[PDB]
């Protein structure tokens, strides 16, 4: 089939994520086939190569055309594809996975890990197992869970309600009344005059305010990012974990971090957890964990909550809790191996000594830069959120599509970074294994792009 | 291999959260573990080293049979090319896009127009919900969100698909089902409180009093199995499928055929849709779209509900519906290669074929036997349900075990048929593969399991 009969073969019959529907199947809004990528680039169906600043959606961590992958995947495939792991049914590689997660990457404490496709499947797990944890203890009223504005958990019904971003809610009917939200904890956004440590007491007292008026009792646990990914790739206060974590510990709230995208080395560290002293009752990984070469997702389950489900099993038989597809192992092939490149290469080690690389040469490209509001990030994270007025704050006319212009320019230009949903942003979560040249012909492009627009709008 | 069999069995129980596992017998070793190594055609072989007849294809799944080098393959061509970029915003690879076509053209029922891709049954169940519910805001009909489902349904084990599904174990504990969901009857004659054309009209009556109640205005769709799988391998009754689809289109109820067991060749027609003359507006798809070799899903979306979408784009932008891995590269190059397989073999005729010999050879052999109430199954699915007293209709008292007892002799006897959930049921769905001769292979293994169990508790 030519490039032109596979486009209408798109336009026709493939339903995408995230793509305007009409735009899309007109023609207005064009396909783009991908078609190779290797090390941090990637090739498209005109033979455009592109720097991925973006790693696919902050996940190919090890870099493109790894076939150490490819390989371990392929003989997992020729010698056992799948089988299920009902009724303890396993293979090797899931076993070894599950030891290796809890030993090597999850913070202390963690005992079990569930294994499902993706970061949205994981969290619903998670919902499902903290409202087991307070039925079998005798809590039944304790079941809300509190999630924070521009939070990004998944995109299903109770995942979509979890995230605080409107486009995941419009038209379906989200949030669920069971999912409230406190405040987006990013101190760029708070009043003239307040400190960093006056903000962090702000965010802790409206948490407490939502406790209240909810009723502790009525709060199963609450969800968090440690770094905000696709809201905005916010960094939290610093303090922001240590007060929000004593919170929840009083009012006996149960803590899910969302690692989706810090986990597997991305922030220098391996989870965010251990980035910033968060100890989680149970967590949520996906992305990184395969880097993913295939598709997987880890529910972590820590001491506490498994020791409910394990009595809850005595006085009530197996849990109803499973996917045909859980435990996969061509998929747990793929991260096994994807966890022997991370930690042979030592990626968290040149995650924390790029990232740093990155955030002072964005600071020094763009931090004066008239376009520029804030520039921010952490490890191998980082943002440029575009302001019409810097001392105010003040935001461009969302119409002007500043963040889009940006994103469209450096594409041209040669590089693949995000608009960021809701605002203009500008997003980098490159692989892990980008070095400090790559990172100054980011910056470069990005300059270039960021000045390009500046011209038109300012 | 660094790791023993033995030590591989301990880490399994201290570190690895099995989907559908008594937790505590399984942590104990009570519920010993069990490793599948490696298998062929219909036959896997365990870490001991025995071998046995997968009468059960995994879960329904692996349709092809096991140790596809061809499969394997693509698998690894496509991981070795480009294993990940995501399809947001337009972006795809040929694979995907071929497999969208080719589902639409030959696989899929007359009027259906796109696909969307996710990881599981279950994520797949959870778009269709989604769906109908943007359907029914953007058409400006808010209170049209209502699902009906059916009692011993499977659709799935999250919050909102676990509400679909009509199995008590997939909601205890879960506060399933949510308020929007609904159950109506199951279509299992033999179990019912009549005529076979009674029962039909019961059925009929029953879904009419619930849309009736609820108020037509209020219900926006209505999901069902082709042939329940999960619930006990129950075909429909004679006329179901007629006069169901006219009491829904009456009511402007949107139709959602779950294929997730039936699709790709199972009955020996292309789907259970194609068997039975079911016209849906919405299909979901899993399982045998790849034989399991890869995690695949999708919803195939027709030509009313993707106009409305479309439509829905222009006035209100872009939907907000995406998952990291929906269109996964390696599972589109999997189900592809899995296509070509089926039709290369033509393995909706060997299904065809093979399948109404296991019927007729199971009704042989279990249609006098004492134990056995309903020999029942249409294609390449088929079961025993054992019951207490034949003329009576009277089942067993559960605690006795008589499912399990069968399922667990036949597996000590050298084949996998499962214990269905909530009943005594023996279920085979084996691989689509499957030869005449193993077909009197597997029965004959079933006899001398129906027989030693009749024997202990007769
Ligand atoms: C923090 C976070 N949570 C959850 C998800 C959902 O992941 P998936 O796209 O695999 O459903 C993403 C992406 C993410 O970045
Ligand atoms: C009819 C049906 N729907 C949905 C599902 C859910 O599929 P998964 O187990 O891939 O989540 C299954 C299994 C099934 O048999």
Redesign the pocket.
């Given at each position: 089939q030519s490039l032109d009969q596979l486009f209408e073969m798109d336009r026709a019959h493939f339903m995408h994520p995230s793509t305007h529907a009409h735009d899309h199947a007109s023609g207005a809004l064009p396909g783009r086939i991908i078609t190779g990528g290797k090390g941090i680039r990637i090739e498209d169906h005109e033979g455009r190569e592109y720097i991925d600043a973006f790693a696919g959606l902050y996940c190919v961590n090890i870099g493109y055309g790894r076939t150490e992958v490819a390989d371990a995947i392929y003989e997992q495939a020729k010698q056992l594809a799948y089988y299920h792991t009902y009724v303890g049914h396993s293979t090797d590689a899931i076993i070894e996975l599950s030891s290796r997660i809890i030993r090597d990457w999850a913070p202390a404490g963690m005992k079990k890990v569930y294994y499902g496709m993706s970061g949205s499947d994981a969290n619903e797990t998670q919902i499902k197992l903290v409202w087991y944890y307070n039925n079998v203890l005798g809590r039944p009223n304790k079941k809300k869970i509190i999630s924070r504005e521009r939070g990004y958990h998944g995109s299903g019904i109770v995942t979509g309600s979890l995230t605080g971003l409107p486009s995941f809610h419009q038209h379906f009917d989200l949030p669920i009344d069971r999912v409230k939200h406190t405040v987006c904890p990013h101190w760029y956004r708070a009043p003239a005059g307040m400190s960093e440590a006056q903000f962090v007491a702000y965010c802790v007292e409206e948490l407490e305010k939502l406790i209240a008026r909810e009723g502790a009792d009525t709060i199963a646990a609450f969800i968090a990012e440690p770094v905000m990914g696709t809201g905005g790739i916010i960094p939290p206060p610093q303090g922001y974990w240590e007060a929000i974590q004593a919170v929840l510990r009083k009012h006996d709230i149960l803590l899910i971090a969302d690692e989706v995208v810090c986990g597997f080395g991305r922030l220098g560290s391996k989870m965010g957890s251990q980035h910033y002293g968060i100890k989680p009752d149970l967590i949520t990984v996906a992305k990184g964990l395969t880097s993913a070469y295939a598709p997987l997702s880890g529910v972590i389950v820590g001491e506490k909550v498994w020791d409910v489900i394990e009595k809850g099993s005595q006085e009530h038989g197996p849990m109803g809790h499973?996917?045909?597809?859980?435990g996969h192992p061509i998929c747990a092939a793929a991260a096994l191996a994807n966890l022997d490149i991370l930690e042979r290469e030592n990626l968290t080690g040149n995650a924390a000594d790029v990232g740093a690389y990155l955030q002072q040469r964005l600071h020094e490209a763009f931090g004066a830069h008239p376009l520029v509001g804030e520039v921010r990030g952490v490890g191998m994270l980082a943002a440029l959120e575009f302001m019409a007025d810097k001392d105010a704050r003040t935001p461009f006319d969302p119409a002007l599509k500043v963040g889009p212009k940006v994103s469209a320019a450096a594409l041209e230009d040669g590089m693949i970074a995000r608009a960021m949903p809701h605002g203009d942003i500008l997003g980098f979560a490159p692989p892990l294994v980008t070095t400090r040249a790559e990172v100054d012909e980011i910056v470069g492009i990005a300059k270039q792009a960021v000045d390009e627009v500046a011209d038109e709008v300012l």
């Open positions: 499973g996917w045909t597809y859980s």
